[model samples]
Each structure stands twice: as C-alpha cells, then as structure tokens.
Target: AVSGKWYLKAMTADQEVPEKPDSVTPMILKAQKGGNLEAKITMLTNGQCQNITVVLHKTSEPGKYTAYQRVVFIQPSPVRDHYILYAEGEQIRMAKLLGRDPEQSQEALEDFREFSRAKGLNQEILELAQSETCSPGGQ
Candidate 1:
C-alpha cells in the first residue's frame, strides 16, 4: 500500500528539480475512507512550514493514482524498504526515490536509475536535499 510517511531520497524531472535545502521537502500519506490516499507535503524555510494537501484519486489500475493533472504511482523495490515514485502528465515526467529512513542507499539509486532508463526518463538522477521530517504525506 502507498499509505505511510515517506521521505525523499532523490528525484529527477524533465524540468528544474526542487532539491533546494530549504524547499518544500517533506510529505505524509494515509488511506482515505474514500478508497484513495490523502497526502500532505510541506516546505520549510525561515523556520516555517507551509502545508499542501492533495488526494491521490483512485484509478482503475491498482497502485495508480491521479492528482493535479498528473498520474502518480509507485514501484516496490527489491529491497522492500525503498520505493520508486513516478509521476507523469501529457508532457511532464518526474521520478523520485522514497525511503523509510533518512539513511541513503546506493542500491536504491541504482534501482531508480534502471527504472528511469526503461521509462524514457532522460534527466540526470540527483540526490534530493535532506528534510528533517516529512511534515505530516503519500505514493
């Protein structure tokens, strides 16, 4: 299930990557009663956190969710504790590495790279800025 508190391990996208140290960097997730996931992400700067909440609307395809004009989903990694987040729109594409802990993993990065290669993601895979916590988020 995509219901849990997850931290960004890293990410890459077709456009600029929001890996800034003080950017909105944390997230949280839970299974909503409506059979979908409720997500809350946060960005901390100047000692303040701004919350942005959204729902991962259910889809016919299991493990797939739709939100903000984009399709969001996850692929479980062989390591179990790591997951790869992928989002795509008509012309936008992004992939993120999610981990249960703040600990970094070379293995997960390699796994993310492989998935990106097969999925036509041509951006440089880079490490995301570390966030102390996922301020309260999903997939």
Candidate 2:
C-alpha cells in the first residue's frame, strides 16, 4: 500500500487507456523527489507502464491559505492505478482561471481568464516534459 499523500488537481477528466478497461484508469503512487511525486499507471493494453509526477504546494486551509510551502510525498505501489501528482502553493491562483465567476472586479476577471489559458498551456508543456523525461538528469 502507498502512503496517504494528497494531490491537487489541474484537470478534472482523466486520460483513457484503450487496452484493459480495469488495468489502469487511475494511478498508484511510487516515489517522491522534492516537490515532485511519481505514480505508476497500468492503463495501456499491452500492460506497459506510464508514470506521472505531480508537483503540489502544501496547504493548511482548504483553498485559500498557503501552508508554509511544504511538499508532501505518497507512494502506492507498482501495479495499482489511480494517483495524483503533487502541486505547490500556487494552485489557488490557478483556480481563479478555471471557471467563470461573477464575484470579481472586471479587471480581476479578465486576468483570471487569461491566466487560466496560460496555465492550461503550462500543463501541456509539463506533460510533454514528463513524457520525454526532459531534465539535466533525464528525470
């Protein structure tokens, strides 16, 4: 069993695997390095392995407060699927960009929309980086 670590979500819908319906829909936690949390997934039909790293900021309050910017780690296992990556302390700001809200000033609202799209783009880049393990150490 993996440890009980938490992950902040950037996207709501999950990726689908065409191979085995029950094999890998979710993720199983694996390792942690700094703010990065890795998980093992078994969604491919050929039983291939795909891993993900989530970076999250630690929080004390639910959605509005930052908690000293701590990083957490969780590990499930190699075979289990369904996990979340860690995110750091800036997700609340990112949340502002996700949905429409009537409770904001016009300028803040516009800024939110623009930021939301930018964050979405950042996510795409992160996915690509993860796929290629693009880092100095090839992490």
Candidate 3:
C-alpha cells in the first residue's frame, strides 16, 4: 500500500550509534516492480552526496521483504503520511522512521519508540535531517 515519496526521518539500532553516521542516508523509492520495490537513495558518503539503488524483494509474509541481506518489515503508522521500517539481520535489528515530511510528528515518534522498546531495540533514535545539497539537481 506504500507508494510515492518518503524521507528517512530517524533511525536506531542495538549499537550505541549506527555506523557511517550521516555519511549514508536514504532518499526515496522510485517504483514498485512486481514483488519488489526499487529504491534510489542519495547518501552523503565520503564527504559529497552519493546515489545508489537497492531493490527490496517481497517475501512470503505481507509487508516483509529482503534488502541487502536483511529481512525488512514495513508498517503504516497511525498517521497517514508516516511509515516505519524494521529490519533484522544476524543478531542485529535496525528500526527507521520515515515520512512524507522531512520531520515526523511527536506522537508518531512515540510510535517509533513504542515499537522499538517492544522489539527490544533502542528507544532513543537519532534523527536524520535531509541535506539540501542532496536534493534533486541541488548539487
């Protein structure tokens, strides 16, 4: 049911801090092809912003998919414009808060926290602010 644009609002994992910091942040999903959604992300890697595409394949479970060796589950929040992504790989779990807006609502943030605490991940999340330099043709 998820379509169109989304921004990476915040994220957290079991680690004290996720690796690479703001060096690599995601941009958006271009399209959903069959059982897969091809995402085009622009991350600030190696100083300048970089673009990469990763395809997430749908799994047997609804709203679940495999991306870059991790099994991911995407869920709709109480708010219409927001979505939460939970990914698991090996012993680590990563949770991301996404939205149509660059920032998320306070209660929806609690939605992320509640989900994280329930999933035994970190409740405190690091907010990822989008870079204007990374915008379409902004560079």
Candidate 4:
C-alpha cells in the first residue's frame, strides 16, 4: 500500500537531476481503509522547502493512486498523473504518469520505463520512495 511516510531517494525531470539530502523533509501519504488518502510532499527548491498537500483517490489495485497536480512551468498544466507505488521488500518506487495498469516491484519499473518512452517522460521524476531510508540512522 501507499501508506506511511516515504523519503525521497532522488528526483529527475527531463535533463535535471536534483540531489536529495537528509536535511530535506520527506513525503507522507496516509491511507485509510476505505480508499481515502492524504498526501504531504515537501520539496526543496532554491534552498527552500515547499510543502504541498493533495487528497488522492485510491483504486481497487494495491499500489495505484490517482491525483491531480498542477505542473509549474512556462505553461501550467493541471495534469492527473497516475502515481503508482511498487514495493519490493522494504523499498518502494514511485512512477508518475505511466499510462498502463500498475504492477509491483521490478515489473512496475519495467512497465514504467516503456510507458515513459511512449509518453515522452524521458525518465523524469523516477523517484525511489523509500520509507525511513533517507535519514542518517535509517540503514
């Protein structure tokens, strides 16, 4: 499930690769039993932390969620990126905007890669959503 807190391992969008530090706050997604979900994502930009909240919808699938977020750029687009969570042991991978049925673990990553190519994602925003692993003491 996409419940609990997840720290950012790294983030990439297009050709930009940003470093994720332990000092930065992580993203938390709380899921209720009956499909209600809340997410808090704290992002670092220009040395500042920008916290955003969104109410998301969880599908019947185990690790699939649908949410609408505005893409801040030269031209703004409020897109509904199908954010999928894939958990393998203790590690989780989050892939955004993949236009396919969500799968788990390595299969999910492989599907996302193909979807990335078709949708021109170009490997942008391939983030490892690991729980408690981004901190200094989290080995």
Best by lDDT: 1
Clashing pairs in 3: none
C-alpha lDDT values of all predictions: 0.75, 0.29, 0.74, 0.43
lDDT of 1 by residue, 35-94 (tens): 898888776544566667988898899888899878998778876588888998757798
Q: Distance from true position, residue 124, model 2, in Å?
A: 23
Residue range 23-116, candidate 3, lDDT tens digits:
3354567556686888776777445666778788987899998988589888988866889999888667889888887764898787888888
Highest-scoring model, TM-score = 3
The better-scoring model by lDDT among 3 and 4 is 3
Q: Estimate each model's TM-score.
A: 0.80, 0.22, 0.82, 0.43
Residue 103 lDDT in candidate 1: 76
Give the C-alpha miss distance for residue 24 in model 4, angstroms.
Answer: 4.2
lDDT of 3: 0.74
How many angstroms is residue 67 displaced in model 1 relative to the true structure, after the best TM-score fit? 0.2
Better structure of 1 and 3 per TM-score: 3
Ranking by TM-score: 3, 1, 4, 2
Scored by Cα lDDT, where does model 1 land? 0.75
Residue 71, candidate 1: alpha-carbon lDDT = 96
Candidate 2: tens digits of C-alpha lDDT, residues 1-139: 3333222112211222222221223333343553333433322223344344443433454322123343432222122232322223433222311111112234433443344355452322111101212122223
True lDDT of residue 125, candidate 3: 84
Looking at candidate 1, the ten consecutive residues that score lowest on lDDT are 130-139
Q: How many Å off is the CA of 45 in candidate 4?
A: 0.7
